[PDB]
Design a protein around this ligand. Structure first.
Ligand SMILES: [Yb+3]
Ligand SMILES: [Yb+3]
Ligand SMILES: [Yb+3]
Ligand SMILES: [Yb+3]
Ligand SMILES: [Yb+3]
Ligand SMILES: [Yb+3]
Ligand SMILES: [Yb+3]
Ligand SMILES: [Yb+3]
Ligand SMILES: [Yb+3]
Ligand SMILES: [Yb+3]
Ligand SMILES: [Yb+3]
Ligand SMILES: [Yb+3]
Ligand SMILES: [Yb+3]
Ligand SMILES: [Yb+3]
Ligand SMILES: [Yb+3]
Ligand SMILES: [Yb+3]
Lengths: 329, 329
């Protein structure tokens, strides 16, 4: 009824060789913890208890003990959690926290392509604009073109959402031809149709890798970890009004390749944003936009001293042009 | 740049008497931990570290030692976190986690009334529909009627959001008369004006307490802890399409006082929803609506076996009527 508390049962098994290959196909997902870390230890144990009846295995591979198995799987960062799914290895870079860890695994455990088979599902599909989407129309699951799409979906999972329909009327409502795939940028209404349908998986993966930095995109707790960062609480009238300004500059510079704004809602990352306040020495719980140096963590911020008078889209774009050209950093 | 890690410094002080009243006025907020709990110990220490330069004090009150101070403040649940703000006592009932705890305190630390002073902020105010809102128009902060609204806002903090404007043009755009207060239900566009303005604080608090159970409302990680609960991932076309049906049933029974739907997005509560799957024996990460018994934790769920054919609002409403009238429990 209330919140789960860890019961003491040790579910994080230690994985040796020979024991390895049996457990990779017993489960959908394997969580491998590569080796004072009682905080990271106890989070992994509580997630394993809540998911003890999901098809997810929780193991730990010691750096010194199973150094054989860590070299066999390519474990670089010690103290990091790696997710194995079939032939693929996913390094978790999010916050090592029970909320964030559960959501990542449950995103990863499902099929990488969500199938839309109803016309009423198309309206809800079209209104969801916060992430990159792809959608295709195929004859059936057995098709080589769906398989290529399915294989491409697996390569980007769970960071980019893939969709398919097998219905002529649904595809008619999406204005999709047979074996065609539409690409949706975040916060833009009109999709991009990938040229020269039908597509192989190498054609799809190469298209998505070119289009991986859209003009505006929303940070997620899954996908994370020079850099233009915008801060706006959508739940706050101030941050929402600033977010609406950011959307207008995103739709005015779809031509501009040197513009990629990362919007961070502080309500989605309350611990991370508060910590960055200590690093960036600015109030990030009100509308802000800045550029951050990846190395030195230096930053310069647009002057928004007065949130009852936020910049217009022309003033944001002019500030952006001064930042891209070279104002300070 | 990356995530904060706890540095070893012990900031959770132990608070005695006489030392008490100095630290209550030294700080804006007092976080009191009432007494194997190394998990709760380490979460509180990281939050105190991240917030070490905020006007927030972190203390712990042992049940047996400072039982004097625990009796003086009224601490019932051991292992619970209580937030003190001036004359007010707030028991934290949410997940004992750094993300949820940080967001709660930063919600509590700000002024309970957010002032809107720009007409462009009014459009953004109107699009934020996920929580109860109140907004009033007063002459200035010095007015006795603003003081009553501010005192009412402090009384519901941080669970219900209060707003005020002091500007004639903003109020005209809000269609607010002077000292008038509008009441906003979640997911309903038209506010309710509280009758017989101007209002005392008792007049406002009593109005809000009658109207605290609206037809549809979204759970928050702050405010939480017979009951119709709906499960819908807004980020998923299935869950979004289901969310759109609930809004339609919400607008059809604004008359019905015995209808109060709690929408829980599984993406907002990944640990709690996965845990409830084990208690309710249902896949809650797809569209669901059920009624839960508060005592026995029994539940009965509307049958949604086929997510390509979700119920319409009439079918939801008919299911609701069988549940309110008496179908099963
Ligand atoms: Yb690496
Ligand atoms: Yb890493
Ligand atoms: Yb999902
Ligand atoms: Yb499947
Ligand atoms: Yb299948
Ligand atoms: Yb594959
Ligand atoms: Yb098309
Ligand atoms: Yb604000
Ligand atoms: Yb969210
Ligand atoms: Yb101002
Ligand atoms: Yb301006
Ligand atoms: Yb209590
Ligand atoms: Yb409690
Ligand atoms: Yb806030
Ligand atoms: Yb007060
Ligand atoms: Yb139906």
């Amino acid at each position: 009824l209330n919140f789960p508390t860890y019961d003491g049962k040790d579910r994080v098994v230690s994985l040796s060789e020979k024991n390895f290959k049996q457990v990779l196909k017993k489960y959908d997902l394997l969580c491998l913890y590569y080796h004072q870390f009682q905080l990271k230890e106890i989070v992994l144990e509580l997630v394993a208890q809540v998911l003890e009846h999901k098809a997810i295995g929780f193991v730990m591979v010691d750096a010194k003990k199973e150094a054989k198995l860590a070299k066999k799987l390519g474990f670089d960062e010690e103290g990091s959690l790696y997710i194995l799914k079939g032939d693929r290895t996913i390094e978790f870079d999010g916050e090592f926290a029970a909320d964030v860890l559960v959501e990542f695994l449950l995103d990863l455990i499902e099929d990488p392509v969500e199938i839309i088979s109803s016309k009423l599902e198309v309206q809800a599909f079209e209104r969801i604009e916060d992430y990159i989407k792809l959608i295709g129309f195929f004859k059936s699951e057995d098709s080589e073109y769906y398989k290529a799409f399915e294989e491409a979906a697996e390569h980007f999972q769970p960071y980019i959402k893939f969709f398919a329909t097998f219905d002529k009327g649904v595809a008619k409502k999406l204005s999709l031809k047979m074996n065609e795939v539409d690409f949706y940028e975040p916060f833009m209404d009109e999709p991009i149709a990938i040229p020269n349908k039908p597509y192989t998986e190498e054609e799809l993966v190469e298209f998505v890798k070119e289009h991986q930095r859209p003009t505006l995109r929303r940070l997620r707790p899954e996908e994370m970890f020079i850099h233009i960062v915008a801060f706006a609480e959508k739940s706050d009238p101030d941050g929402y009004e600033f977010l609406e300004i950011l959307k207008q500059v995103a739709r005015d510079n779809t031509d501009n390749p040197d513009l990629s704004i990362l919007w961070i809602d502080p309500d989605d990352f309350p611990l991370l944003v508060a910590y960055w306040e200590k690093t960036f020495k600015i109030d990030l719980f009100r509308p802000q936009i800045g550029v951050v140096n990846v190395t030195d963590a230096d930053s310069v911020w647009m002057e928004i001293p007065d949130d009852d008078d936020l910049p217009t889209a022309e003033e944001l774009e002019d500030w952006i042009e001064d930042v891209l050209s070279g104002k300070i950093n």
